[PDB]
Amino acid sequence: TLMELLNQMDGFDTLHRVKMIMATNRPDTLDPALLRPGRLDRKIHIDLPNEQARLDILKIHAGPITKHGEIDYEAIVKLSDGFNGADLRNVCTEAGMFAIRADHDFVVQEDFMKAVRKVADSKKLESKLDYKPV
């Protein structure tokens, strides 16, 4: 079933306006014949957010949130080390959870850092997150 792909990717019949997008987690477990250029042209590398990236995504999820004019995104990023976009999304979720705690419809800044501590604590179970390309 894979060799059908290998054929009908390059094979005899060429292709036109047919774009192939592939997604994975570890490239190391793939077939080199599939990994050679021509079939799989370019390998785009995605990595964890930098500091500015973390600040940006944080601002992204931070938009539609009933809060106060008190948000220190910078400190949260400072405690923010290696977290997925879904991770920061998790932070925004948990901070709202603490807000539901005590039933304060607004959002205080401290619940942010608390949720950051919780989520960051939760990452004591994820090892081997990197994989060599190819």
CB of 8 to other proteins, least distance (A): 17
Vertex 55, ends 53 and 57: CA angle to 5°? 70
Selection from other proteins, Mg ion, none that 110 binds (CB < 5 to 8 A by kind) is: other proteins
Tell me the residue number closest to Mg ion, measured at CB.
Answer: 10
In this structure, what is the dihedral angle of CA atoms 76, 79, 85, 91, given to the nearest 10 degrees?
Answer: -60
Selection from Mg ion, other proteins, none that 51 binds (CB < 5 to 8 A by kind) is: other proteins
CB of 64 to other proteins, least distance (A): 26
Q: Does 41 bind other proteins (CB under 8 A)?
A: yes
Out of 23, 29, 37, 46, the only residue in the binding site for other proteins (CB under 8 A) is: 37
CB of 5 to Mg ion, least distance (A): 11
